[PDB]
Amino acid sequence: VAGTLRLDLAAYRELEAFAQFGSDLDKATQAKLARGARTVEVLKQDLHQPIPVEKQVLIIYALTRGFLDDIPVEDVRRFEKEFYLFLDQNGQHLLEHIRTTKDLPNEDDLNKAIEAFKKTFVVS
Amino acid sequence: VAGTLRLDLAAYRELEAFAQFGSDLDKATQAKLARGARTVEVLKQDLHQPIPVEKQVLIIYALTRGFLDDIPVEDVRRFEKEFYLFLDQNGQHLLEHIRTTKDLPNEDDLNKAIEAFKKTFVVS
Amino acid sequence: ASLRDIKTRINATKKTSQITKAMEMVSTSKLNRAEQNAKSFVPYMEKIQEVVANVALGAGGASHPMLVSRPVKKTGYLVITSDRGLAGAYNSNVLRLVYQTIQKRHASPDEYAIIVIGRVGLSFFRKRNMPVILDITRLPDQPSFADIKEIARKTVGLFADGTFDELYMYYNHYVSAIQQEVTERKLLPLTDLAENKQRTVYEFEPSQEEILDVLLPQYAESLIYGALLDAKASEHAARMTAMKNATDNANELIRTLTLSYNRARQAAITQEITEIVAGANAL
Amino acid sequence: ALAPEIVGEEHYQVARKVQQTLQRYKELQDIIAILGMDELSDEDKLVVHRARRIQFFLSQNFHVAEQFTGQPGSYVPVKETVRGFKEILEGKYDHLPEDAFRLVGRIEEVVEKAKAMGV
Amino acid sequence: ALAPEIVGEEHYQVARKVQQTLQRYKELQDIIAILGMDELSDEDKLVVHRARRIQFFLSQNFHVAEQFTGQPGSYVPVKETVRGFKEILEGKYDHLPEDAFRLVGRIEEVVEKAKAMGV
């Protein structure tokens, strides 16, 4: 997932200065300005709160697979914070699989878990 | 009289960095540039030509109260010289008031004297 | 050189670079908005072209191919130029071509007659020996039809009474943001068209001689409006490319000056070290 | 010490928003300097209008400045200053002249100066 | 010795004006390089046009320089120098080419050199 994250963040990092006037449709607005801003939002971290590598993998996979495209930027951090608790409550199988195999779990199971969490989230 | 001069010079030096970009600048900006140019012309002085403070204050008042804003830049030195000449034949009361009380004379009298000089001044 | 002067030079160049980059950023949005106005102009012009391409063939009118609108010494030129500068040779090309053609064909100042839209155009024409009829100092960057509707109506009225021999418009189209070329064209007396008639009664309650005198002026005004919109787009593109090139040049100068400063100050540092070494040795 | 847990959440948010507005106003000056402020979008004009007043309200009259100016000084509590800056940011003083914010103490003295100026 | 009471006002004003024009031309170099010649105002364009000709006219052909170049050299009186520079500053010789002013004596030799070049 690091490969996709690098590309998204880099693209935002050469296209931030053009934000004076968003235009050119997908070449600037829908992908570069949105995905990059969401990446910057998810890469922020609070003081003295390290998080497990499995949770990092979950959240960055969710970012890269476009599951955060509908969430507004102001709600991204709260989405991540609630997603960590939802994982701790319902995704023990996924967390154990990652912790024991150093590899991503089944893609369909991961996608259905992410969708199940996104069902219960409220945008505010 | 020095307080407004300091602010005018500060504004002129701040906005002079934009003078190279054409002529269609903001109306306040070329007004500030016009004031600063006349201020620079006023501050100029010859060699071995000391000027009494009672005349320095009057010329600075004339510059900073807008009475000089219609004389062209090229005529500022001659305007100053002719004003110094005029202040010896007329307006001796203002010079005496400044020299004795160390304060500015009455506003009406000084404005009337400046207008009287401007009436007889010839412009090229 | 002196390090103080070098630093002041670099700082001034950086400030100019920032200003030019801001200008280019603004011009990009202005071009993006002007393109939509051009696209919105296109349909009305297309409808008028498909409407007037056939009914023009017929009897004489106020603006038919007559060339006898007092065909003496009073032809007018519509010149379109920018209001602000910093666009390079944009206005200069149009001004030079207008001056050259008018000086060639017109022998005497009485033969001269022009109308200009743009402050630089007024300035250049007043510096030269040109007669000014009407002028517009400024227009919105996204002009509506009503902004020049009355002026175009005035041009049509001056074509009436024979006070315009024939009308010429001089402006610049854009092939793209990079390419702009000067256009000269002969508009009102309507030299050429094409026959595509499928019409018998469509808006024909007035006769051919009764509809032309009113219809043709709006056709000309719409053409003038479209030419103005295209010229505005070309102006925005020219400012874009000029500011981009200016930023590139300023950054090149910044790089060279920074290299010079860095190479210069190390020599002073090494000279100080050498002085320290010599002083220590001498004791 | 400028942390939410040290100075308070309200203080931290007010200070951060003031800094953001001033930083945003910093870039727009050259565009304002050449082209008119009408070129700016609607929000940018409000940003400039409030940034001028914030900059002028940052100034204060000192007790020791009596020997220089003749105007007596004042002491401003932190609660008073954060309340005043929050009010300025939210825009309840957008109609007062910007000159009334210069060399002033509490926000009430700004209204007093504006009234003395003829508002 | 460059004082009004020593060389005269006629000489002093011309010298000061030449120095001022050369200083302005030196200052204009950066903006010319990073913005182009066409972006200068008509005042600055005239300043550059006069300053290049003044700088070229400052050159001279020396008698001892005949061993380096075949030109014989010349001797120019102070009155002639002052008159020539005043005429250049007045704009009389704006239509002559730039290189016609290089390595000549009196202001007339510029005219004959331009005629030889074909003006």
CA-based nearest residue in chain E for residue C89? E38
Token pair for C136? 């517009």
- Binary contact (C85, B18; C-beta < 8 A): no
Q: Which fold has domain D9-117?
A: 1.10.1140
Separation of alpha carbons C41 and C225, rounded Å: 8
In a mutagenesis test of the D interface, which of B24, B25, B26 is the best target, namely the one with the most D β-carbons within 10 Å? Answer: B26
Of E34, E36, E39, the CB nearest to C13: E34
Binding partners of D (≥3 Cβ pairs within 8 A): B, C
C20 to chain A nearest CA, in Å?
A: 14
Contact E38 C12 (CB under 8 A): no
Question: How many Cβ contacts (< 8 angstroms) between chains B and C?
Answer: 14
**Residue listed under structure tokens 């010649």:** E37
- Phi and psi of C277, rounded to 5°? -65, -45
**Domain span at residue C99?**
21-242
The answer to whether residue D33 neighbours chain B at the CB level (below 8 Å) is: yes
C-alpha closest to that of E35 among B77, B19, C237: B19
Contact C15 B22 (CB under 8 A): no
**Is B24 in Cβ contact with C19 (below 8 Å)?**
no
- At residue B23, the 3 state secondary structure works out as coil
Chain E residues with CB within 8 Å of chain C CB? 30-31, 33-36, 38-39
For residue D10, CA distances in Å to D7, D14, D51 come to 8, 6, 20
AA identity, residue C111: E
| CA–CA distance, E44 with E36 (Å, rounded to integer) | 12
Domain count, chain C: 1
Against chain B, the chains showing at least 3 CB pairs within 8 Å are C, D, E
Per residue, the 3-state secondary structure of chain D, as one string, reads: CCCHHHHCHHHHHHHHHHHHHHHHHHHHHHHHHHCCHHHCCHHHHHHHHHHHHHHHHCCCCCCCCHHHHCCCCCCCCHHHHHHHHHHHHHCCCCCCCHHHHCCCCCHHHHHHHHHHHCC
Q: Among candidates D100, D71, D70, which has minimal Cα distance to D84?
A: D100
Q: Best of E38, E39, E42, E43 to disrupt the C interface by mutation (most C CBs within 10 Å)? A: E38
Subunit contact B18:D34, Cβ cutoff 8 A: yes
Q: Considering just the CA atoms, what is the radius of gyration of chain C in Å?
A: 28
**Would you kindly state where each structural domain of chain D is located, as residue ranges?**
9-117
Q: Is residue C98 part of a domain?
A: yes
As beta bridge partners, residue C170 has: C79, C184
In the sheet that holds C76-80, the strands lie side by side as: C132-136, C114-117, C76-80, C167-174, C180-186
Residue B45 in marked binding region: yes
Taking an 8 Å cut-off on Cβ atoms, the answer to whether C25 and A21 are in contact is yes
In angstroms, rounded to a whole number, what is the distance separating the alpha carbons of residues C159 and C164?
4
B21 vs C contacts (CB less than 8 Å): 19, 86
CATH of the domain at C87: 3.40.1380.10
Nearest to E56 by CA among E9, E114, E3: E114
- State yes or no: chains C and E have 3 or more CB pairs below 8 A: yes
d(CA C272, CA C278) in angstroms, rounded, equals 10
One-letter amino acid of C22? A
Which residues in chain C touch residue E30, judged by CB atoms under 8 angstroms apart?
9, 12-13, 253
In D, which residues are within 8 Å of B18 by CB distance?
30, 33-34
Chains near C with 3+ CB pairs less than 8 A apart are A, B, D, E
Is residue A119 within 8 A of residue A68, CB to CB? The reply is no
Q: Count CB atoms within 10 A of the CB of residue D65.
A: 14
Query: CA dihedral defined by E52, E57, E63, E69, rounded to 10 degrees?
Result: 40
Q: Do D34 and B25 touch (CB under 8 A)?
A: yes
Structure-token pair, residue E110:
């510029």
* Partner-chain contact C29 A20, CB within 8 Å: yes
DSSP structure string for E12-37: HHHHHHHHHHHHHHHHTHHHHHHH-G
Asked if B touches C (at least 3 Cβ pairs < 8 angstroms), the answer reads yes
Amino acid at E73: G
Asked whether E89 and E49 are in contact (CB, 8 A), the reply is no
Whether residue C266 is contained in a domain is answered as: no
Looking up tokens 């033969």, which residue turns up? Answer: C111
Q: Residue D14 and residue D23: Cα distance in Å, rounded?
A: 14
Q: What is the spatial distance between Cα D45 and Cα D37, in angstroms, rounded to a whole number?
A: 7
Cα separation values, B82 from A42, B75, B90, C211, C255, Å: 72, 11, 12, 72, 52
Contact yes or no for C22 and D30 at CB 8 A: yes
**Tokens describing residue E5:** 């009471």
As a whole number of angstroms, the distance between CA C24 and CA C85 comes to 13
Residues in C lying within 8 Å of A, measured between beta carbons: 25-26, 28-29, 32
Sign of the CA dihedral with C38 first, then C43, C47, and C50 last: positive
Number of C-beta neighbours around residue C12 at 10 A:
16
Q: How far apart are CA B69 and CA B75, in angstroms?
A: 11
| Determination technique for this entry | cryo-EM
Q: Is C279 helix (H, G, I), strand (E, B) or coil?
A: helix
Q: Mark yes or no for CB contact C29/A21 under 8 Å.
A: yes
CB contact under 8 A, C85 and B17: no
Name E36's Cβ contacts closer than 8 Å, sequence gap at least 6: C88, C246
Q: Which residues of B touch C242 (CB under 8 A)?
A: none
Please, are residues E47 and E20 in contact by the beta-carbon 8 Å criterion?
A: no
Strand partners, B69: none
**Which chain D residues are Cβ-neighbours of C18 within 8 angstroms?**
30
DSSP 3-state assignment of C164? coil
C275: in domain:
no
